[PDB]
């Protein structure tokens, strides 16, 4: 008759709550590590969320489901594009399984390092720690028996102006300066 | 219980899902070579690659194009219904080499003769089948004539 | 926004295809592998039933096709059908007359094509 | 013809001979059982896909040790191929 | 590989595959029972089938 599936099994979460309880809602915030922008999810992000690609015409229920049955329930036939799509869809799986296999025989052979990142990343980025073994990272060992105190970040929003409403402070605040455009 | 987990301990690696968010023709040929090694052609393509060091060496250079996600292999075993007692090595050992775009061969001519040899092995399969049948029939006729004369 | 933040886990949704597709019985214990392993190896559309035949409507690989001229194999099997002189076509390696221009440094160009690159060609044509 | 969701049962059937090809016969047997009930209801007498799937069903019975059941089924397949207008040349070959 | 394109008969007609392994099974049975003439008959028919194809 009609087909609605989100899954290969056809299963789902319990889409409706018990009567008289509170519903579970999706996080509407775009998923970003930084808390400050706080930006609502785009339509495209909602389509990524609901198990499509970015577009209605890929990877969703809108592909996998046949456009038509017959009246008696006899289904459709396999298009060249349908078969090609099945090949792609299994190409992803083959890709994943081969990647995982490579990781597994790499840590079987023991080539997965205990030091995160490559050498290029190490000498680019002062985040990754120095992995020095038997020495202290910063000179010799610190004694065992606050940078912001002297560092000033105070952003001055409005620039302080020159007191023309007072005669003495006008001339005492004099700036002896000559405007020069670069030659 | 405020204690270290009792081991046998297993080591589980990671897997990078890589997505290309920028046009490669905007960028130099070295960045493009790196994107090629990551199996990315155009804007909008997504690939799955291993967490081994070489791959990170590649992803680090193109990081201003590629956006990355990580899945450790327990999570990869979860993402697809895969019984946990089944590893990925056996699963890889099962799937056929004959999968599309099987190898990285150095120039298109070699690619062409790779496919050509793929067809050649088919022809030789059927020919060897028929020829084997002719062989066995020949032996049956030989034994028959020998047992008949004697 | 064109800068989208979301895990790229969803660029490749696996919800639709589990390993039950590529490994037919994986929830059992045998790991059979059924993969349709190219886009090339598609055999074709075929009917589900006798009752509902597949319609006949042509493509350009069908509808535009000329009548069959006898090649050299068909006249070898059955000499009965060599009936007239037009069947006497020569060795198939003969393509026809030279139909175009070999223009230096750009390809084989077409008669009635772009002559912009013909300078070298024209000058070569009139002849430590 | 009466409505039966043939898409679903077909999916069920190919899962069936994946089971049979995969080296476990009992389960292919029950699968074919379900699907053959479906085709038995959905199609008229002596239809091609009906006798087809009970060819497969005879094949499934035969592998599990129910031999006589397989024999009975395949003879019924024969006498259904008998009463068919123009059966498939592939089906009679596979059957026998 | 456009000039060398090959399509195996064990694909495009399943009938041929069926009769082929049919005769293979028959020939095995003939080997077990000890019929020489039968086995020769079967392999001849099979050969003729394959080169007919």
């Amino acid at each position: 008759y009609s087909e609605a599936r989100s899954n290969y099994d056809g299963t789902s979460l319990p889409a409706w709550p018990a009567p008289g309880k509170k519903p579970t809602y999706p996080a509407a915030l775009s998923e970003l590590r930084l808390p400050q922008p706080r930006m609502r999810k785009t339509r495209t992000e909602w389509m990524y969320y609901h198990g499509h690609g970015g577009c209605p015409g890929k990877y969703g229920p809108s592909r996998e489901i046949a456009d038509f049955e017959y009246a008696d329930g006899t289904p459709a036939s396999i298009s060249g594009r349908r078969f090609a799509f099945k090949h792609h869809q299994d190409h992803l799986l083959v890709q994943l399984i081969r990647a995982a296999a490579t990781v597994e025989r790499y840590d079987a052979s023991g080539l997965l390092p205990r030091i995160p990142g490559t050498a290029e990343q190490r000498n680019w980025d002062p985040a990754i720690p120095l992995f020095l073994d038997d020495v202290d990272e910063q000179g010799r060992p610190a004694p065992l028996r606050d940078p912001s105190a002297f560092v000033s970040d105070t952003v001055k929003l409005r620039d302080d102006k020159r007191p023309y409403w007072s005669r003495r402070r006008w001339a005492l605040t004099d700036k002896f300066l000559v405007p020069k455009s670069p030659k | 219980a405020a204690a270290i987990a009792p081991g046998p301990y297993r080591r589980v690696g990671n897997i990078f899902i890589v997505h290309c968010d920028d046009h490669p023709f905007k960028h130099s040929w070295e960045v493009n070579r790196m994107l090629r090694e990551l199996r990315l052609e155009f804007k909008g393509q997504t690939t799955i690659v291993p967490d081994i060091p070489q791959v990170r060496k590649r992803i680090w250079r193109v990081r201003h194009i590629v956006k990355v996600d990580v899945l450790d292999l327990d999570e990869a075993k979860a993402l697809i219904g895969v019984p946990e007692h089944i590893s990925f090595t056996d699963l890889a050992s099962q799937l056929p080499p004959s999968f599309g775009r099987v190898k990285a061969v150095p120039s298109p001519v070699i690619r062409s003769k790779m496919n050509f040899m793929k067809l050649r092995r088919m022809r030789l399969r059927d020919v060897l089948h028929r020829d084997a049948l002719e062989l066995r029939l020949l032996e049956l006729k030989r034994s028959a004539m020998k047992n008949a004369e004697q | 926004r064109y800068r989208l933040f979301h895990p790229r886990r969803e660029a490749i949704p696996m919800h639709m295809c589990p390993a039950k597709t590529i490994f037919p019985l994986i929830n059992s214990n045998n790991l059979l592998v059924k993969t349709r392993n190219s886009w090339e190896d598609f055999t074709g559309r075929k009917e589900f039933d006798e009752d509902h035949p597949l319609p006949v409507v042509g493509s350009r690989l069908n509808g535009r096709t000329t009548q069959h001229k006898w090649n050299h194999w068909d006249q070898y099997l059955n000499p009965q059908i060599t009936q007239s002189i037009k069947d006497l076509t020569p060795t198939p390696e003969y393509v026809g007359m030279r139909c175009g221009h070999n223009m230096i440094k750009m390809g084989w160009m077409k008669i009635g094509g772009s002559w912009k690159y013909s300078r070298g060609y024209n000058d070569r044509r009139r002849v430590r | 013809r009466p409505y039966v969701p043939l898409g679903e049962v077909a999916k069920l059937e190919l899962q069936g001979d994946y089971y049979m090809e995969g080296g476990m016969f009992q389960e292919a047997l029950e699968h074919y059982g379900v699907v053959a009930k479906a085709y038995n209801y959905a199609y008229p007498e002596n239809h091609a896909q009906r006798i087809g799937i009970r060819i497969k069903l005879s094949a499934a019975f035969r592998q599990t040790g129910r031999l006589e059941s397989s024999l009975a089924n395949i003879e019924e397949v024969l006498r259904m191929l008998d009463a068919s207008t123009r059966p498939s040349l592939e089906l009679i070959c596979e059957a026998l | 590989e456009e000039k060398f394109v090959y399509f195996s008969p064990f694909d495009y007609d399943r009938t041929f595959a069926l009769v082929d392994q049919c005769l293979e099974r028959a020939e095995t049975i003939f080997n077990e029972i000890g019929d020489v003439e039968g086995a020769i008959r079967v392999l001849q028919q099979r050969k003729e089938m394959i080169d007919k194809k």
Binding site: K58, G80, R81, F83, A84, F85, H88, H91 | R39, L40, E41, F42, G44, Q45, T46, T47, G100, R101, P108, R111 | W39, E40, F42, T43, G44, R45, K46, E47, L54, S59, L61 | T85, R86, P87, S88, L89, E90, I92 | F7, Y12, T15
Partner: peptide, 29 residues
């Protein structure tokens, strides 16, 4: 250039893809 077929690729239209009819037993037999 060489194709990786990383993205989705539709198949080609090729003559092996013809819908080949099933052989039928004759009517009288």
């Amino acid at each position: 250039v060489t194709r990786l077929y990383t993205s989705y690729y539709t198949g080609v239209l090729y003559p092996n893809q013809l819908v080949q009819p099933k052989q039928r037993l004759p009517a009288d037999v």
